[PDB]
C-alpha cells in the first residue's frame, strides 16, 4: 500500500503513514540541498480511489525547518500512487523559498520525483 | 497569527486556516460555490521562524478533493509564501493531480497560480 | 495582427513580436533594464485559426539567454494564451532551465507566471 | 550532438536541426493526445555552452495545428542537453489550450519528457 518507507532517484527517504481519514503523516530526509536529517511532513490522499486501474491521487508538504536547520522554504509534492508488481509514487513538486517581492520570480523551483520502496 | 484566519481568492475560493507554533497548517478549503457540499480538509506546513531581511514566509498545503458529499479522485498542492502587510497576501503556484491510468499520466497534472487575500 | 506588436510585463520586461500567417512568432525580448545589452532573440508558434467560442488563442515562445554581450547559459519558455480586448493581454506560465550538472538537475528549473499587456 | 532524430518515453518523435545562430527548427510527432502526423516546431538553444560538464540549455514550442488537425493548444518544452555515452534531452513542458477566462484554471497541463536517439 501507500504506507511504508520510500526512496526516490536522488536517494532521499520518504517514510509515510496513510490514515483512513485521508490523512498523510511522516518524515522526509533529503539527499540534496540545504537539508539535514529528518523533517516533518503532512498531506492528503484519496481514501476511496477508483477501481478502473487508475492511480490514487495524493499530495504532501515539507517545510524545510527542523531543530538542525532552517532553509526558509517549503516543498509540495503532487502525484499519484500506482499499483503493480513494482509499486511506485510518481510526483511533480514545487519548491518555494521565502523572498523579497523583487526576487519572487526566482522563488520557485519545479521538478519530478519517482518513489519506490527499494 | 498572520497566516491564521480566513482567506479568499479572486475566483471566489475561500479557506480558513490555523497556523500552529509547531509549523502545522490545518483547516478547511471551500470552492467557489458557497456550500457545505464544497468544503474539504486542508493540511500543510510553514516556516515558523522566517528570515528577518524582508523575505516572505514559505509555506505549502494540500487538499484531496474528497468529502462526505463527493469524490473527484484528485488532489491539489499549493506552494508559495506569505507576505505581511495592511492587506496581507499569500502568493502561490499549484499542482492538481488526478488519478489516471499509466497511459494517461501525461495529462494527469494541471498547473496554475493563485493569490489569496486575508479578510 | 492582434498578437503582432509590443508588449510589457509588470516587472518592466518588454518584447516586440511579429505573428506570421504561417503560425510563426518572431521578435525580440528585452529584460527589465532598458538597454541593448539586454535584448535577446524570441522564437515561437501560435494557433493561426483559434476557436470562435470565446476561447483565447494558444501560443508559446522561447528565449535562450545568450546575445552578443552576455551568456547566462539558460533558456525560458512561455506557454499561454492571447486574450483580445480594448486592453489586450497575454497570460503565461513559464519555465526557466539553466545548464547544470546531472547532480544539480533537480535545482535546474524555475517556474513562474507573467501577464503581458499590449501598447 | 543536438541535431538529429529523438524519441521520448511516450514514443513521440522529435526531429530537430540546431543552427549556429542558436536557432532550433524541425518537426514533432506526438504519440498521445489530439495530434496527427507532424507539426512544426521552433526554438532556441545556447550555442556556446559551459565546459564544466554542465548541460546545454534549450527550449522549443509546438502549436498543435497542421493541415490535418487543430487542437487549439501549444506546448513548450524547457530543458537541457546532457552529453554522455547515451545522450539525452531532459525536459519539463507546459501545454496550454485556449479557454474562456472562467476556464483558465484548467488551461495548462504540466509534465516531464526524457528524449533519446533510440
Ligand atoms: O534547500 C532547500 C531545501 C531542500 C530541497 C530538496 C528538494 S525538495 C524536491 C527534491 N526532492 C528531494 O528529495 N529533494 C529535493 N530549498 C531552498 C534552496 N533553494 C535552492 O537550492 C535554489 C533555488 C534557486 C536557485 C537559482 C537562483 C538563485 C539565486 C539567483 O540569483 C538566481 C538563480 O537562478 C536560478 C536559475 C535556475 O534556472 C535554477 C535555479 C536558480 C538556486 C541555485 O541556482 O543554486 C538554488
Ligand atoms: O491534445 C493536445 C495536443 C497534444 C499534446 C501532446 C503532449 S505535448 C507534451 C507531451 N509529450 C509528447 O510527446 N506528447 C504530449 N492538447 C490539448 C488537449 N488537452 C488535453 O488533452 C486535456 C487537458 C485538460 C484536461 C483536464 C480537464 C478538462 C476539462 C475539465 O472540465 C476538467 C479537467 O480536469 C483535469 C484535471 C486534471 O488533473 C488533469 C487534466 C484535466 C484533460 C482531460 O482530463 O482529458 C485533457
Author numbering:
A (entry chain B), D (entry chain B): 16 to 133
B (entry chain A), C (entry chain A): 15 to 133
What does the literature reporting this entry say, word for word?
The femtomolar affinity of streptavidin/avidin for biotinylated targets, combined with resilience to harsh conditions and an on-rate of ~ 107 M− 1 s− 1, is the basis for biotin's central role as a specific biological “glue” in diverse research methods and biotechnologies. To generate a controlled and stable bridge for bionanotechnology, we demonstrate here a method for the simple isolation of streptavidin variants with precise cis-divalent or 1,3 trans-divalent arrangements.
To understand interaction between ligand binding sites, we solved 1,3 trans-divalent streptavidin's crystal structure bound to biotin-4-fluorescein. Biotin-4-fluorescein represents the largest ligand where there is a crystal structure with streptavidin or avidin, as well as a widely used probe of the binding kinetics and capacity of biotin-binding proteins. Our 2.3-Å-resolution structure shows the 1,4 dimer in the asymmetric unit (one copy of SAe and one copy of D). Building the native streptavidin tetramer from this dimer shows that the two biotin-4-fluorescein molecules are in the expected trans arrangement. All the contacts of the 1,3 trans-divalent streptavidin with the biotin moiety are as expected. Fluorescein and the ethylene diamine spacer form several non-polar contacts to streptavidin not observed with biotin. Trp120 is 5 Å from fluorescein and may explain part of the quenching of fluorescence. Biotin-4-fluorescein bound in chain b reaches over and interacts with residues of chain d.
